[PDB]
């Protein structure tokens, strides 16, 4: 199927800063991946982004009542939907599960929400920042995230490694210890 | 770590000649819901979201008729200039660390592509499989490309290997991304 394609995308973007204290509304019109015309609540009217969108900015700016309602939409649309969704989006918290296994030592941190997280490696109580490689943050598409943080290390006998995770869902770090084989152990 | 900003996006599109169109809301990269045009039904991404909110699906159908009308006008205004295909990136991951015989899910994450038409197949030991598969709608990106997820439930094995096979008009060849235990 090599028939030519023609695509039209519309986006209404509600940008929130400091709760609903600061709210900006964008309406963006995009043909074949290129934005042609845009309403920005900072400007209060349509503006062409490319020459292809000039006709539309002119025509839509002439419809004054609808333009008034679009200037009000920071309240009637953006703030409204934020209030409806807050409890299950803004305030969603799902605790990470932490698994440590050799592959390298891998600290797999899964199932968590929101995305901001800190994962740290310790060796015998001391933080190790060298030989660390991370996937970064991966969005799973189902309102959870994962990340894998690898430590390249020469695991000796007697060594004890700890993966530590801080995340807004917990008030104290999650830790998982992994130990190499014991060589010799003694009474004292 | 606590988020300093949030973005809610209502993302719609119409595509010719396919006559495909979608309507969804996105919160910081996750789908809140979409309207299934054929069922005329609001589909919440997690079913519990619908305990807290409702959406009248008919409004999305009305919007998609405006989007189609405008697409027809833009197509001619551009002198029938077609979209440039941009092929996807693909990644395959499991949802959780794998444990033998414990139900898990393979995720095929398809990213950075346009137009929003893909053909995705799962293979097990080289053979197509479909039992229990699911997928998302086409999710938005800041560069106006798309994202999409496909999922395959499975029982992890030391012997079975899987591929996600992705076909798109911007690819010279179909792509495979494998996964094994």
């Amino acid at each position: 199927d090599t028939r030519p394609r023609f695509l039209w995308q519309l986006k209404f973007e509600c940008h929130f800063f400091n709760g609903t204290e600061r709210v900006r509304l964008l309406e963006r019109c995009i043909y074949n991946q290129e934005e042609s015309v845009r309403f920005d609540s900072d400007v209060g009217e349509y503006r062409a982004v490319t020459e292809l969108g000039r006709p539309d900015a002119e025509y839509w700016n002439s419809q004054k009542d609808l333009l008034e309602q679009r200037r009000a939409a920071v309240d009637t649309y953006c703030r409204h939907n934020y209030g409806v969704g807050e409890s299950f989006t803004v305030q969603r918290r799902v605790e990470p599960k932490v698994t440590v296994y050799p592959s390298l030592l891998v600290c797999s941190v899964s199932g968590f929400y929101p995305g901001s997280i800190e994962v740290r490696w310790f060796r015998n109580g001391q933080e190790e920042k060298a030989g660390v490689v991370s996937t970064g943050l991966i969005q799973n598409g189902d309102w959870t995230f994962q990340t894998l943080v690898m430590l390249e290390t020469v695991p000796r006998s007697g060594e004890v490694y700890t993966c530590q995770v801080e995340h807004p869902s917990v008030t104290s770090p999650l830790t998982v210890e992994w130990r190499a084989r014991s060589e010799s152990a003694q009474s004292k | 770590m606590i988020k300093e900003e949030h973005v809610i996006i209502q993302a719609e599109f119409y595509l010719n000649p396919d006559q495909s169109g979608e309507f969804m809301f996105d919160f910081d990269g996750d789908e809140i819901f979409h309207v299934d045009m054929a069922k005329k039904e609001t589909v919440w991404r997690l079913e519990e979201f619908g305990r807290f909110a409702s959406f009248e699906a008919q409004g999305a159908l009305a919007n998609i008729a405006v989007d189609k009308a405008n697409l027809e006008i833009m197509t001619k205004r551009s002198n029938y200039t077609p979209i440039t295909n941009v092929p996807p990136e693909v990644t395959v991951l499991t949802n959780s660390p794998v444990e033998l015989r414990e139900p898990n899910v393979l995720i095929c994450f398809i990213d950075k592509f346009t137009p929003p038409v893909v053909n995705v197949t799962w293979l097990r030991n080289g053979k197509p499989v479909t039992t229990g598969v699911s997928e998302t709608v086409f999710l938005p990106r800041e560069d106006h490309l798309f994202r999409k997820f496909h999922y395959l439930p499975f029982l992890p094995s030391t012997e079975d290997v899987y591929d996600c096979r992705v076909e798109h008009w911007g690819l010279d060849e179909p792509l495979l991304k494998h996964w094994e235990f």
């Binding site: 539309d56 025509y59 409806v84 | 209502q10 809301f25 409004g59 919007n63 405006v66 405008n70």
Partner: peptide, 15 residues
Amino acid sequence: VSKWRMATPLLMQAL
């Protein structure tokens, strides 16, 4: 249960 709202795009000029 609270109602989620949508914004509606405008029709382009047809003539």
